[PDB]
Amino acid sequence: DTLVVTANRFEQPRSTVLAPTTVVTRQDIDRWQSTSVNDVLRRLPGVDITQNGGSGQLSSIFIRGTNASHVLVLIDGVRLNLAGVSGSADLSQFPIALVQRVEYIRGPRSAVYGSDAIGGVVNIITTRDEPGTEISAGWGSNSYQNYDVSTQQQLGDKTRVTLLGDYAHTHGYDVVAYGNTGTQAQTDNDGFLSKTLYGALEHNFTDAWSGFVRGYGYDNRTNYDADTRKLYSQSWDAGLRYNGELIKSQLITSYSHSKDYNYDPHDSSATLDEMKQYTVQWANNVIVGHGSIGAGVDWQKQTTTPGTGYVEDGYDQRNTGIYLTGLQQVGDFTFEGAARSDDNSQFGRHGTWQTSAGWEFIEGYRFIASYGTSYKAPNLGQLYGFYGNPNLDPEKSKQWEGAFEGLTAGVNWRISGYRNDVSDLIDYDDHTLKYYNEGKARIKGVEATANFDTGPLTHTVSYDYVDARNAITDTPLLRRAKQQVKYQLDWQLYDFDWGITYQYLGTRYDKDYSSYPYQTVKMGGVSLWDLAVAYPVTSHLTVRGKIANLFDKDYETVYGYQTAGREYTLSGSYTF
Ligand SMILES: CCCCCCCCOCCOCCOCCOCCO
Ligand SMILES: CCCCCCCCOCCOCCOCCOCCO
Ligand SMILES: CCCCCCCCOCCOCCOCCOCCO
Ligand SMILES: CCCCCCCCOCCOCCOCCOCCO
Ligand SMILES: CCCCCCCCOCCOCCOCCOCCO
Ligand SMILES: CCCCCCCCOCCOCCOCCOCCO
Ligand SMILES: [Ca+2]
Ligand SMILES: [Ca+2]
Ligand SMILES: [Ca+2]
Ligand SMILES: [Ca+2]
């Protein structure tokens, strides 16, 4: 699709969004045959994701060079629950079987959404309009197994129902470990089992007035090393929507409750984390000329259990923000903007804002200037942990960005450079065994994308340069590749749909924890290749297969944790 929602909360056509943005749909994923959300995001511009091995293992998403907690991940609009305890997003446990759509807008959006939107935003949408029931599942190269039953149907005039179950499981391959593990080893394939359940009830009172109720949860258990971690999550949403010709409005609610254990192996000696986050937001938008204007109020409650986050007492964190959005188109120029004020139960008030203007100085070509401001809340652990500091302020970012975007000779392209200066970075002082706000980073980047067709061939290429450094010491930051290259090539032929995807993961610096003291290591970086194919046996059956890492490239995204290697997958789906 070409109209997202994530930018200002309500539908608008992407072309109207001045910030770089990307959309992935459910048809994409099925094609891509992704078995995990990281797989999907790893493909898109500006994304650098690392992982302690295969599937289920902790992972980190760095967008355009920012720390891993500097990305806001929303599910169906709402701040990712899993991110709550740690103050940092990791989709590693989120069920891909719930993903219907994803919308990703890079750059700051705190001025719309609050804390965490620094690098950009990620909005995983779990909703579809696609009636019928579908059965599917697959088999693969490490006992990977999956099966899943889905269906959406009508329940009479104006009400529709959605139901879904899915179970995927693939014991692993040992992810060695290094640094961690200590004395012995872990000669054991570290599996992950995920079982999901999802149900939605959508209701139109009228042609404009709508309503819904969803409920979903998953029970995961993905063993790691140097320990089996068992995770339960459930979330609940319900809202009303009015969508008129001129006036749009939404009122939304949600509650998610998570329980994240790790044993064992076999009680006593295990840290359970438990969070309950409560959200209510109200937002309006109206069409005004060739533009819109908008505002909403947005409230949050997160309360944690004692022991959670390795923090002494339970905590009850509250936040309320209020913001204003605008888009106007005039003549050849475009203006878009937002401003927010947030009142946090801990640090108080902090406001934020962004503007961008574009000039289409010649048909099909557009020059865009953006300046935007964002923030990142301190987390429990910096606040109330053994080394805590309850008076921390938020970490603060300023970004400037220029772009040229245009359609020339059958090819759509864009090229941006941004600068991101982060400040008040929450860092630990050995001197006082406390955290304080003090660090700086400067990030210097370049994104270039392009898609275009040449015969039955479709190309979708992207390139990123990230110079992310500690601004005081002038040194590169770790865990981040300076350069990635991503290319997808799609084409059909006889009745076979093909896709080859190529990635080059640049060279990164990390640390070697196997042993103290902990030395920095330079990882060379590689090229990876996956190949995929599907074929409609009938009109109802489609069979696919995939070779991932088609050559057998050995590499790590995190020093010491072994990655998959070449895996095979054979899969199918049956719609009726
Ligand atoms: C009705 C409020 C519209 C602006 C809300 C966000 C504005 C935040 O800073 C924007 C101002 O700085 C540049 C002003 O010129 C264009 C503002 O953006 C036009 C919004 O469509
Ligand atoms: C919706 C429009 C919001 C406009 C945001 C941009 C304007 C921000 O003003 C200046 C930013 O820094 C604010 C402090 O102003 C100067 C502080 O000087 C006094 C120091 O004690
Ligand atoms: C309708 C809600 C309006 C939200 C706009 C405020 C967003 C944050 O303010 C703009 C950026 O921050 C500038 C404010 O910082 C200066 C604070 O000045 C406070 C002096 O009381
Ligand atoms: C940084 C981006 C620079 C953009 C320069 C584009 C300027 C003009 O580009 C296209 C102009 O059209 C001429 C190219 O071929 C014309 C095709 O039109 C067919 C009949 O005239
Ligand atoms: C308008 C898009 C800028 C195009 C990037 C390639 C051309 C660069 O020209 C000079 C190179 O600048 C060196 C810095 O490179 C990274 C800087 O990125 C953004 C920091 O301002
Ligand atoms: C990129 C400079 C040329 C002007 C834009 C060309 C359109 C780019 O589309 C292709 C992008 O795919 C890889 C681009 O690599 C070229 C630029 O990398 C330069 C970094 O300074
Ligand atoms: Ca192991
Ligand atoms: Ca193990
Ligand atoms: Ca035009
Ligand atoms: Ca120091």
Side-chain angles (χ1 to χ4, degrees), residues 514-545:
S514 64
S515 110
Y516 193 95
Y518 305 135
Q519 357 159 316
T520 34
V521 45
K522 193 151 157 222
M523 321 204 310
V526 296
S527 287
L528 304 168
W529 292 82
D530 324 289
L531 179 74
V533 282
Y535 190 100
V537 131
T538 76
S539 110
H540 289 156
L541 207 203
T542 267
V543 184
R544 319 193 214 235

PDB file of all heavy atoms in Angstrom, residues 514-545:
ATOM      1  N   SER A 514      33.506 -13.544  27.016  1.00  0.00           N
ATOM      2  CA  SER A 514      34.076 -14.788  27.403  1.00  0.00           C
ATOM      3  C   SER A 514      35.033 -14.499  28.547  1.00  0.00           C
ATOM      4  O   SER A 514      35.199 -15.312  29.501  1.00  0.00           O
ATOM      5  CB  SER A 514      35.000 -15.288  26.252  1.00  0.00           C
ATOM      6  OG  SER A 514      36.116 -14.382  26.043  1.00  0.00           O
ATOM      7  N   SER A 515      35.684 -13.341  28.446  1.00  0.00           N
ATOM      8  CA  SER A 515      36.781 -13.134  29.378  1.00  0.00           C
ATOM      9  C   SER A 515      37.133 -11.723  29.699  1.00  0.00           C
ATOM     10  O   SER A 515      37.295 -10.870  28.833  1.00  0.00           O
ATOM     11  CB  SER A 515      38.073 -13.680  28.853  1.00  0.00           C
ATOM     12  OG  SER A 515      38.882 -12.543  28.560  1.00  0.00           O
ATOM     13  N   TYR A 516      37.443 -11.545  30.965  1.00  0.00           N
ATOM     14  CA  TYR A 516      37.870 -10.284  31.422  1.00  0.00           C
ATOM     15  C   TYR A 516      39.340 -10.191  31.214  1.00  0.00           C
ATOM     16  O   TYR A 516      40.063 -11.183  31.307  1.00  0.00           O
ATOM     17  CB  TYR A 516      37.669 -10.150  32.915  1.00  0.00           C
ATOM     18  CG  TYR A 516      37.810  -8.733  33.363  1.00  0.00           C
ATOM     19  CD1 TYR A 516      36.701  -7.918  33.501  1.00  0.00           C
ATOM     20  CD2 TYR A 516      39.038  -8.208  33.611  1.00  0.00           C
ATOM     21  CE1 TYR A 516      36.805  -6.651  33.899  1.00  0.00           C
ATOM     22  CE2 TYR A 516      39.125  -6.931  34.058  1.00  0.00           C
ATOM     23  CZ  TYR A 516      38.014  -6.168  34.200  1.00  0.00           C
ATOM     24  OH  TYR A 516      38.151  -4.888  34.621  1.00  0.00           O
ATOM     25  N   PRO A 517      39.775  -8.970  31.011  1.00  0.00           N
ATOM     26  CA  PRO A 517      38.806  -7.901  30.936  1.00  0.00           C
ATOM     27  C   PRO A 517      38.191  -8.064  29.546  1.00  0.00           C
ATOM     28  O   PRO A 517      38.563  -9.078  28.896  1.00  0.00           O
ATOM     29  CB  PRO A 517      39.647  -6.641  31.161  1.00  0.00           C
ATOM     30  CG  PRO A 517      40.927  -7.166  31.606  1.00  0.00           C
ATOM     31  CD  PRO A 517      41.124  -8.465  30.873  1.00  0.00           C
ATOM     32  N   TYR A 518      37.290  -7.174  29.150  1.00  0.00           N
ATOM     33  CA  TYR A 518      36.481  -7.399  27.966  1.00  0.00           C
ATOM     34  C   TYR A 518      37.058  -6.590  26.844  1.00  0.00           C
ATOM     35  O   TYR A 518      37.059  -5.373  26.898  1.00  0.00           O
ATOM     36  CB  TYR A 518      35.011  -7.042  28.280  1.00  0.00           C
ATOM     37  CG  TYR A 518      34.523  -7.809  29.495  1.00  0.00           C
ATOM     38  CD1 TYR A 518      33.789  -7.201  30.502  1.00  0.00           C
ATOM     39  CD2 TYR A 518      34.854  -9.180  29.640  1.00  0.00           C
ATOM     40  CE1 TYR A 518      33.365  -7.934  31.638  1.00  0.00           C
ATOM     41  CE2 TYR A 518      34.463  -9.914  30.768  1.00  0.00           C
ATOM     42  CZ  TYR A 518      33.726  -9.283  31.744  1.00  0.00           C
ATOM     43  OH  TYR A 518      33.304 -10.028  32.779  1.00  0.00           O
ATOM     44  N   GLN A 519      37.639  -7.257  25.861  1.00  0.00           N
ATOM     45  CA  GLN A 519      38.326  -6.561  24.769  1.00  0.00           C
ATOM     46  C   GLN A 519      37.367  -6.288  23.605  1.00  0.00           C
ATOM     47  O   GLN A 519      36.363  -7.026  23.382  1.00  0.00           O
ATOM     48  CB  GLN A 519      39.506  -7.386  24.297  1.00  0.00           C
ATOM     49  CG  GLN A 519      39.743  -8.681  25.101  1.00  0.00           C
ATOM     50  CD  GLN A 519      40.572  -9.690  24.321  1.00  0.00           C
ATOM     51  OE1 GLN A 519      40.306  -9.892  23.107  1.00  0.00           O
ATOM     52  NE2 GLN A 519      41.554 -10.318  24.979  1.00  0.00           N
ATOM     53  N   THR A 520      37.612  -5.177  22.932  1.00  0.00           N
ATOM     54  CA  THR A 520      36.853  -4.886  21.686  1.00  0.00           C
ATOM     55  C   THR A 520      37.371  -5.711  20.532  1.00  0.00           C
ATOM     56  O   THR A 520      38.598  -5.853  20.342  1.00  0.00           O
ATOM     57  CB  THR A 520      36.975  -3.413  21.198  1.00  0.00           C
ATOM     58  OG1 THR A 520      38.286  -2.905  21.515  1.00  0.00           O
ATOM     59  CG2 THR A 520      36.002  -2.529  21.925  1.00  0.00           C
ATOM     60  N   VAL A 521      36.437  -6.228  19.745  1.00  0.00           N
ATOM     61  CA  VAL A 521      36.805  -7.026  18.588  1.00  0.00           C
ATOM     62  C   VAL A 521      36.209  -6.479  17.286  1.00  0.00           C
ATOM     63  O   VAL A 521      35.065  -6.004  17.261  1.00  0.00           O
ATOM     64  CB  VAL A 521      36.352  -8.493  18.778  1.00  0.00           C
ATOM     65  CG1 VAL A 521      34.935  -8.561  19.306  1.00  0.00           C
ATOM     66  CG2 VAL A 521      36.456  -9.253  17.462  1.00  0.00           C
ATOM     67  N   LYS A 522      36.981  -6.548  16.198  1.00  0.00           N
ATOM     68  CA  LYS A 522      36.478  -6.084  14.896  1.00  0.00           C
ATOM     69  C   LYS A 522      35.956  -7.217  14.032  1.00  0.00           C
ATOM     70  O   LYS A 522      36.685  -8.063  13.601  1.00  0.00           O
ATOM     71  CB  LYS A 522      37.576  -5.361  14.117  1.00  0.00           C
ATOM     72  CG  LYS A 522      37.087  -4.576  12.908  1.00  0.00           C
ATOM     73  CD  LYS A 522      38.009  -3.369  12.637  1.00  0.00           C
ATOM     74  CE  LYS A 522      37.928  -2.906  11.199  1.00  0.00           C
ATOM     75  NZ  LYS A 522      39.266  -2.550  10.604  1.00  0.00           N
ATOM     76  N   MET A 523      34.672  -7.224  13.773  1.00  0.00           N
ATOM     77  CA  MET A 523      34.119  -8.264  12.950  1.00  0.00           C
ATOM     78  C   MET A 523      34.155  -7.829  11.501  1.00  0.00           C
ATOM     79  O   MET A 523      33.712  -6.737  11.171  1.00  0.00           O
ATOM     80  CB  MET A 523      32.694  -8.561  13.428  1.00  0.00           C
ATOM     81  CG  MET A 523      32.577  -8.510  14.955  1.00  0.00           C
ATOM     82  SD  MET A 523      31.213  -9.456  15.641  1.00  0.00           S
ATOM     83  CE  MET A 523      29.931  -8.842  14.621  1.00  0.00           C
ATOM     84  N   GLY A 524      34.712  -8.673  10.637  1.00  0.00           N
ATOM     85  CA  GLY A 524      34.797  -8.349   9.209  1.00  0.00           C
ATOM     86  C   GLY A 524      33.455  -7.966   8.543  1.00  0.00           C
ATOM     87  O   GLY A 524      33.272  -6.893   7.988  1.00  0.00           O
ATOM     88  N   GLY A 525      32.494  -8.859   8.567  1.00  0.00           N
ATOM     89  CA  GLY A 525      31.260  -8.524   7.925  1.00  0.00           C
ATOM     90  C   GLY A 525      31.128  -9.302   6.679  1.00  0.00           C
ATOM     91  O   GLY A 525      32.129  -9.655   6.101  1.00  0.00           O
ATOM     92  N   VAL A 526      29.894  -9.561   6.271  1.00  0.00           N
ATOM     93  CA  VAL A 526      29.707 -10.456   5.184  1.00  0.00           C
ATOM     94  C   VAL A 526      28.630 -10.129   4.182  1.00  0.00           C
ATOM     95  O   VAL A 526      28.067  -9.051   4.200  1.00  0.00           O
ATOM     96  CB  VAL A 526      29.429 -11.799   5.791  1.00  0.00           C
ATOM     97  CG1 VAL A 526      30.654 -12.254   6.554  1.00  0.00           C
ATOM     98  CG2 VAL A 526      28.284 -11.702   6.726  1.00  0.00           C
ATOM     99  N   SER A 527      28.521 -11.020   3.184  1.00  0.00           N
ATOM    100  CA  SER A 527      27.442 -11.012   2.262  1.00  0.00           C
ATOM    101  C   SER A 527      26.640 -12.241   2.555  1.00  0.00           C
ATOM    102  O   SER A 527      27.204 -13.295   2.737  1.00  0.00           O
ATOM    103  CB  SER A 527      27.992 -11.146   0.844  1.00  0.00           C
ATOM    104  OG  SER A 527      28.617  -9.961   0.400  1.00  0.00           O
ATOM    105  N   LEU A 528      25.329 -12.104   2.587  1.00  0.00           N
ATOM    106  CA  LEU A 528      24.406 -13.220   2.708  1.00  0.00           C
ATOM    107  C   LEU A 528      23.379 -13.315   1.543  1.00  0.00           C
ATOM    108  O   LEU A 528      22.999 -12.322   0.962  1.00  0.00           O
ATOM    109  CB  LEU A 528      23.688 -13.062   4.028  1.00  0.00           C
ATOM    110  CG  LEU A 528      24.686 -12.971   5.171  1.00  0.00           C
ATOM    111  CD1 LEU A 528      24.101 -12.531   6.540  1.00  0.00           C
ATOM    112  CD2 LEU A 528      25.296 -14.351   5.295  1.00  0.00           C
ATOM    113  N   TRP A 529      22.885 -14.516   1.242  1.00  0.00           N
ATOM    114  CA  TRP A 529      22.016 -14.735   0.110  1.00  0.00           C
ATOM    115  C   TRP A 529      20.969 -15.701   0.591  1.00  0.00           C
ATOM    116  O   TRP A 529      21.310 -16.694   1.198  1.00  0.00           O
ATOM    117  CB  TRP A 529      22.695 -15.403  -1.090  1.00  0.00           C
ATOM    118  CG  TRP A 529      23.694 -14.537  -1.749  1.00  0.00           C
ATOM    119  CD1 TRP A 529      24.973 -14.355  -1.356  1.00  0.00           C
ATOM    120  CD2 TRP A 529      23.515 -13.720  -2.901  1.00  0.00           C
ATOM    121  NE1 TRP A 529      25.623 -13.476  -2.192  1.00  0.00           N
ATOM    122  CE2 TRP A 529      24.726 -13.049  -3.142  1.00  0.00           C
ATOM    123  CE3 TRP A 529      22.439 -13.486  -3.758  1.00  0.00           C
ATOM    124  CZ2 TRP A 529      24.910 -12.183  -4.196  1.00  0.00           C
ATOM    125  CZ3 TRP A 529      22.612 -12.597  -4.804  1.00  0.00           C
ATOM    126  CH2 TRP A 529      23.851 -11.952  -5.024  1.00  0.00           C
ATOM    127  N   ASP A 530      19.704 -15.381   0.357  1.00  0.00           N
ATOM    128  CA  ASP A 530      18.617 -16.334   0.571  1.00  0.00           C
ATOM    129  C   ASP A 530      17.851 -16.437  -0.728  1.00  0.00           C
ATOM    130  O   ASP A 530      17.767 -15.487  -1.485  1.00  0.00           O
ATOM    131  CB  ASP A 530      17.636 -15.808   1.573  1.00  0.00           C
ATOM    132  CG  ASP A 530      18.269 -15.033   2.658  1.00  0.00           C
ATOM    133  OD1 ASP A 530      18.942 -15.660   3.490  1.00  0.00           O
ATOM    134  OD2 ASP A 530      18.134 -13.794   2.804  1.00  0.00           O
ATOM    135  N   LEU A 531      17.270 -17.580  -0.974  1.00  0.00           N
ATOM    136  CA  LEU A 531      16.492 -17.771  -2.171  1.00  0.00           C
ATOM    137  C   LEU A 531      15.110 -18.285  -1.836  1.00  0.00           C
ATOM    138  O   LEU A 531      14.954 -19.150  -0.959  1.00  0.00           O
ATOM    139  CB  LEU A 531      17.124 -18.800  -3.061  1.00  0.00           C
ATOM    140  CG  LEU A 531      16.339 -19.072  -4.331  1.00  0.00           C
ATOM    141  CD1 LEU A 531      16.575 -17.889  -5.175  1.00  0.00           C
ATOM    142  CD2 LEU A 531      16.839 -20.301  -5.058  1.00  0.00           C
ATOM    143  N   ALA A 532      14.095 -17.759  -2.498  1.00  0.00           N
ATOM    144  CA  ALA A 532      12.761 -18.287  -2.225  1.00  0.00           C
ATOM    145  C   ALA A 532      11.829 -18.481  -3.403  1.00  0.00           C
ATOM    146  O   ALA A 532      11.937 -17.822  -4.409  1.00  0.00           O
ATOM    147  CB  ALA A 532      12.121 -17.413  -1.204  1.00  0.00           C
ATOM    148  N   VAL A 533      10.890 -19.401  -3.255  1.00  0.00           N
ATOM    149  CA  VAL A 533       9.966 -19.682  -4.325  1.00  0.00           C
ATOM    150  C   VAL A 533       8.637 -20.169  -3.818  1.00  0.00           C
ATOM    151  O   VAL A 533       8.551 -21.007  -2.909  1.00  0.00           O
ATOM    152  CB  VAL A 533      10.383 -20.754  -5.328  1.00  0.00           C
ATOM    153  CG1 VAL A 533      11.384 -20.210  -6.311  1.00  0.00           C
ATOM    154  CG2 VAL A 533      10.853 -21.984  -4.595  1.00  0.00           C
ATOM    155  N   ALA A 534       7.611 -19.709  -4.497  1.00  0.00           N
ATOM    156  CA  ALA A 534       6.278 -20.235  -4.306  1.00  0.00           C
ATOM    157  C   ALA A 534       5.567 -20.555  -5.617  1.00  0.00           C
ATOM    158  O   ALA A 534       5.937 -20.087  -6.713  1.00  0.00           O
ATOM    159  CB  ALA A 534       5.516 -19.283  -3.491  1.00  0.00           C
ATOM    160  N   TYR A 535       4.547 -21.398  -5.513  1.00  0.00           N
ATOM    161  CA  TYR A 535       3.870 -21.939  -6.658  1.00  0.00           C
ATOM    162  C   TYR A 535       2.489 -22.389  -6.287  1.00  0.00           C
ATOM    163  O   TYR A 535       2.285 -23.230  -5.439  1.00  0.00           O
ATOM    164  CB  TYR A 535       4.632 -23.106  -7.229  1.00  0.00           C
ATOM    165  CG  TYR A 535       4.093 -23.568  -8.575  1.00  0.00           C
ATOM    166  CD1 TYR A 535       4.722 -23.171  -9.750  1.00  0.00           C
ATOM    167  CD2 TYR A 535       3.006 -24.417  -8.670  1.00  0.00           C
ATOM    168  CE1 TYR A 535       4.272 -23.619 -10.966  1.00  0.00           C
ATOM    169  CE2 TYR A 535       2.538 -24.852  -9.884  1.00  0.00           C
ATOM    170  CZ  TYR A 535       3.180 -24.460 -11.034  1.00  0.00           C
ATOM    171  OH  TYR A 535       2.727 -24.898 -12.278  1.00  0.00           O
ATOM    172  N   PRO A 536       1.538 -21.860  -7.004  1.00  0.00           N
ATOM    173  CA  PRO A 536       0.114 -22.112  -6.724  1.00  0.00           C
ATOM    174  C   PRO A 536      -0.192 -23.431  -7.344  1.00  0.00           C
ATOM    175  O   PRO A 536      -0.354 -23.489  -8.544  1.00  0.00           O
ATOM    176  CB  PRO A 536      -0.585 -20.968  -7.434  1.00  0.00           C
ATOM    177  CG  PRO A 536       0.552 -20.129  -8.011  1.00  0.00           C
ATOM    178  CD  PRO A 536       1.728 -20.996  -8.181  1.00  0.00           C
ATOM    179  N   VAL A 537      -0.233 -24.481  -6.547  1.00  0.00           N
ATOM    180  CA  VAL A 537      -0.613 -25.776  -7.062  1.00  0.00           C
ATOM    181  C   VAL A 537      -2.025 -25.664  -7.651  1.00  0.00           C
ATOM    182  O   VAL A 537      -2.308 -26.231  -8.724  1.00  0.00           O
ATOM    183  CB  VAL A 537      -0.612 -26.769  -5.973  1.00  0.00           C
ATOM    184  CG1 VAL A 537      -1.901 -27.517  -6.017  1.00  0.00           C
ATOM    185  CG2 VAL A 537       0.556 -27.716  -6.136  1.00  0.00           C
ATOM    186  N   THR A 538      -2.927 -24.953  -6.992  1.00  0.00           N
ATOM    187  CA  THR A 538      -4.254 -24.879  -7.551  1.00  0.00           C
ATOM    188  C   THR A 538      -4.816 -23.498  -7.732  1.00  0.00           C
ATOM    189  O   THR A 538      -4.609 -22.823  -8.734  1.00  0.00           O
ATOM    190  CB  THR A 538      -5.197 -25.602  -6.619  1.00  0.00           C
ATOM    191  OG1 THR A 538      -5.460 -24.785  -5.485  1.00  0.00           O
ATOM    192  CG2 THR A 538      -4.546 -26.787  -6.043  1.00  0.00           C
ATOM    193  N   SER A 539      -5.603 -23.085  -6.768  1.00  0.00           N
ATOM    194  CA  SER A 539      -6.091 -21.757  -6.734  1.00  0.00           C
ATOM    195  C   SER A 539      -6.198 -21.613  -5.284  1.00  0.00           C
ATOM    196  O   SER A 539      -6.238 -20.527  -4.742  1.00  0.00           O
ATOM    197  CB  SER A 539      -7.473 -21.631  -7.359  1.00  0.00           C
ATOM    198  OG  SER A 539      -8.443 -21.374  -6.342  1.00  0.00           O
ATOM    199  N   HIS A 540      -6.211 -22.756  -4.626  1.00  0.00           N
ATOM    200  CA  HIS A 540      -6.289 -22.774  -3.165  1.00  0.00           C
ATOM    201  C   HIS A 540      -5.009 -23.145  -2.421  1.00  0.00           C
ATOM    202  O   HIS A 540      -4.804 -22.700  -1.294  1.00  0.00           O
ATOM    203  CB  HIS A 540      -7.381 -23.757  -2.744  1.00  0.00           C
ATOM    204  CG  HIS A 540      -8.771 -23.283  -3.035  1.00  0.00           C
ATOM    205  ND1 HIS A 540      -9.847 -24.133  -3.198  1.00  0.00           N
ATOM    206  CD2 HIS A 540      -9.270 -22.022  -3.156  1.00  0.00           C
ATOM    207  CE1 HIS A 540     -10.939 -23.418  -3.422  1.00  0.00           C
ATOM    208  NE2 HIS A 540     -10.614 -22.133  -3.389  1.00  0.00           N
ATOM    209  N   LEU A 541      -4.243 -24.049  -2.996  1.00  0.00           N
ATOM    210  CA  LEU A 541      -2.987 -24.437  -2.450  1.00  0.00           C
ATOM    211  C   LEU A 541      -1.857 -23.699  -3.036  1.00  0.00           C
ATOM    212  O   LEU A 541      -1.784 -23.554  -4.210  1.00  0.00           O
ATOM    213  CB  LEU A 541      -2.782 -25.923  -2.751  1.00  0.00           C
ATOM    214  CG  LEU A 541      -1.898 -26.695  -1.777  1.00  0.00           C
ATOM    215  CD1 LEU A 541      -1.325 -27.922  -2.458  1.00  0.00           C
ATOM    216  CD2 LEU A 541      -0.808 -25.831  -1.292  1.00  0.00           C
ATOM    217  N   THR A 542      -1.005 -23.159  -2.194  1.00  0.00           N
ATOM    218  CA  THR A 542       0.305 -22.708  -2.635  1.00  0.00           C
ATOM    219  C   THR A 542       1.477 -23.287  -1.829  1.00  0.00           C
ATOM    220  O   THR A 542       1.484 -23.287  -0.625  1.00  0.00           O
ATOM    221  CB  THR A 542       0.280 -21.268  -2.465  1.00  0.00           C
ATOM    222  OG1 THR A 542      -0.138 -20.682  -3.693  1.00  0.00           O
ATOM    223  CG2 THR A 542       1.668 -20.779  -2.190  1.00  0.00           C
ATOM    224  N   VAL A 543       2.453 -23.863  -2.498  1.00  0.00           N
ATOM    225  CA  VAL A 543       3.572 -24.500  -1.824  1.00  0.00           C
ATOM    226  C   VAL A 543       4.795 -23.651  -1.980  1.00  0.00           C
ATOM    227  O   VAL A 543       4.997 -23.070  -3.009  1.00  0.00           O
ATOM    228  CB  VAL A 543       3.781 -25.830  -2.458  1.00  0.00           C
ATOM    229  CG1 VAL A 543       4.822 -26.523  -1.760  1.00  0.00           C
ATOM    230  CG2 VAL A 543       2.499 -26.623  -2.365  1.00  0.00           C
ATOM    231  N   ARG A 544       5.624 -23.499  -0.957  1.00  0.00           N
ATOM    232  CA  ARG A 544       6.797 -22.630  -1.087  1.00  0.00           C
ATOM    233  C   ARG A 544       7.938 -23.388  -0.498  1.00  0.00           C
ATOM    234  O   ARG A 544       7.727 -24.351   0.233  1.00  0.00           O
ATOM    235  CB  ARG A 544       6.630 -21.303  -0.342  1.00  0.00           C
ATOM    236  CG  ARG A 544       5.236 -20.679  -0.478  1.00  0.00           C
ATOM    237  CD  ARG A 544       5.114 -19.271  -0.030  1.00  0.00           C
ATOM    238  NE  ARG A 544       3.793 -19.038   0.542  1.00  0.00           N
ATOM    239  CZ  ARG A 544       2.971 -18.097   0.134  1.00  0.00           C
ATOM    240  NH1 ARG A 544       3.301 -17.300  -0.878  1.00  0.00           N
ATOM    241  NH2 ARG A 544       1.817 -17.965   0.749  1.00  0.00           N
ATOM    242  N   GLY A 545       9.131 -22.885  -0.684  1.00  0.00           N
ATOM    243  CA  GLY A 545      10.261 -23.536  -0.083  1.00  0.00           C
ATOM    244  C   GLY A 545      11.172 -22.362   0.002  1.00  0.00           C
ATOM    245  O   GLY A 545      10.891 -21.395  -0.663  1.00  0.00           O
TER     246      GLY A 545
END
